[PDB]
Amino acid sequence: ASMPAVERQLIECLHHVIKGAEPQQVGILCPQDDQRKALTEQFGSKTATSFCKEVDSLKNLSNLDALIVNQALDEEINDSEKLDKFITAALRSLRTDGVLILRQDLSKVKEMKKMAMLTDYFDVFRLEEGNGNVGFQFYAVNEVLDSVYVHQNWLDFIWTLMKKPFPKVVSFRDFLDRTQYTDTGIFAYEWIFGNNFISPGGWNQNLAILKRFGPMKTGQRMLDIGVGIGGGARQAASEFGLQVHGVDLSTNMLAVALERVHKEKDARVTYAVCDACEYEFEPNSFDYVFSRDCIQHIKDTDKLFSRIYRALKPGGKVLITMYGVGHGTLSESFKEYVSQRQYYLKNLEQIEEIAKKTGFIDIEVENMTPRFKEILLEERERIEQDKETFLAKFSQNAYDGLVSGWKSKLQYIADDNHNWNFFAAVKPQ
Numbered sequence: 001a002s003m004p005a006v007e008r009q010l011i012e013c014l015h016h017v018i019k020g021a022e023p024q025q026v027g028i029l030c031p032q033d034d035q036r037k038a039l040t041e042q043f044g045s046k047t048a049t050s051f052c053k054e055v056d057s058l059k060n061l062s063n064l065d066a067l068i069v070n071q072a073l074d075e076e077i078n079d080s081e082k083l084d085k086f087i088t089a090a091l092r093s094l095r096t097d098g099v100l101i102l103r104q105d106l107s108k109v110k111e112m113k114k115m116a117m118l119t120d121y122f123d124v125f126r127l128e129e130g131n132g133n134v135g136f137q138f139y140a141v142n143e144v145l146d147s148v149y150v151h152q153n154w155l156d157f158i159w160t161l162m163k164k165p166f167p168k169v170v171s172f173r174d175f176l177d178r179t180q181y182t183d184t185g186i187f188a189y190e191w192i193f194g195n196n197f198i199s200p201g202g203w204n205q206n207l208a209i210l211k212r213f214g215p216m217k218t219g220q221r222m223l224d225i226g227v228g229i230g231g232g233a234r235q236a237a238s239e240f241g242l243q244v245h246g247v248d249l250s251t252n253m254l255a256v257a258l259e260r261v262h263k264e265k266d267a268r269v270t271y272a273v274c275d276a277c278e279y280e281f282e283p284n285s286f287d288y289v290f291s292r293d294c295i296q297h298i299k300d301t302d303k304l305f306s307r308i309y310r311a312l313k314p315g316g317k318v319l320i321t322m323y324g325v326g327h328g329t330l331s332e333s334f335k336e337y338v339s340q341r342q343y344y345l346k347n348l349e350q351i352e353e354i355a356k357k358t359g360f361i362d363i364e365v366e367n368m369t370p371r372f373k374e375i376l377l378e379e380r381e382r383i384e385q386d387k388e389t390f391l392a393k394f395s396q397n398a399y400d401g402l403v404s405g406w407k408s409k410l411q412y413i414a415d416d417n418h419n420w421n422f423f424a425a426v427k428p429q
């Protein structure tokens, strides 16, 4: 039971990709006439619009700059052969670089990983076109906000995808989902770190970090970059009354965050799947940007920092904790760990240099490695002590990997290879 706010959000999603352009040809697949007309009225005279009410009518659409598909796939999401026909027809109808905005409510789909599985399905599909393939490049998955605020529904999704040419090479997103942040990896991490957290020290430590923002007020807006399974965002909202928007590139991670907020219900918290280095955030809109033990994953720190600066309100504050590299002689074992994780580590000097260049003022940096060491020791006595309860849930292979990993990090700290760094700063004015 949606409202016109939904169609406006669908068009905003389109403009994340096409920016100031008005699309010349738009197709709309939407079986409900009122929603379809609401979408049509969003466009002006520079746009020609074609609409249909069933997917087989997509055969009549071509050369589209954008295809908006709204609540049309109830059958397809339960039937791969029908879904394949749709993806095929969608790809044929779009120009190369054309944008698909797909809205589908998954709240009546009991399977909680459905959003993630659909995203992977779209990302993998290939169609022969000419002497190569075409397929969809991933941009984002957003929640329909009307559904959160009016219907307590966090599982109403909008995919933003773009048609691209492909050869006949694993993505960053797929690397995260297939290696470090598999479902079993995620839940094994949560077990050691603490409920809802994938970061050192769990709830108590995250609260201590949040306090280093200084005074925060109810209703202020926070962007959480690399929100994981949501514990930090949920805590910022529940403890300080912040409105928190969390983003993560991993669908495995966000599937958990989304399942949990949909069940528990807190309208202060919303989530999006996207790459925080690419995604179009509203400029000058956030009071705070928080990133907890995420950015060691991100190579282009300069780009990230400029994007953070852009998204902050003047006077707003950024606070980040991250794995970093120390000043000791690097061991081959640490280097293999770094290479296998694909971490792009920096030291505090480097972070401060980048923050100054970006234009941040009031820069604070801290080497929190001694606290990191305490946390690793406490965490390890816990896995070692609760071995029997762990083995009831996960494999022996998973268990030994946690024990050996924590042992290893302790030695990496000892050589001053592995550091745990803090950075905060403010946008001028």
Ligand SMILES: Nc1ncnc2c1ncn2[C@@H]1O[C@H](CSCC[C@H](N)C(=O)O)[C@@H](O)[C@H]1O
Residues within 6 Å of the ligand: 176, 181, 196, 197, 198, 199, 225, 226, 227, 228, 229, 230, 231, 232, 247, 248, 249, 250, 253, 274, 275, 276, 277, 291, 292, 293, 294, 295, 297, 298
């Ligand atoms: N470029 C990027 N954009 C968005 N998220 C990213 C990212 N690079 C890494 N990540 C995410 O950063 C997360 C790090 S795990 C820590 C999660 C959470 N902040 C916590 O405190 O519990 C991972 O889920 C990973 O997917």
Ligand SMILES: CNCCOP(=O)(O)O
Residues within 6 Å of the ligand: 189, 198, 199, 293, 294, 341, 405
């Ligand atoms: C977010 N940090 C998660 C743990 O990563 P690891 O310490 O296993 O390299």
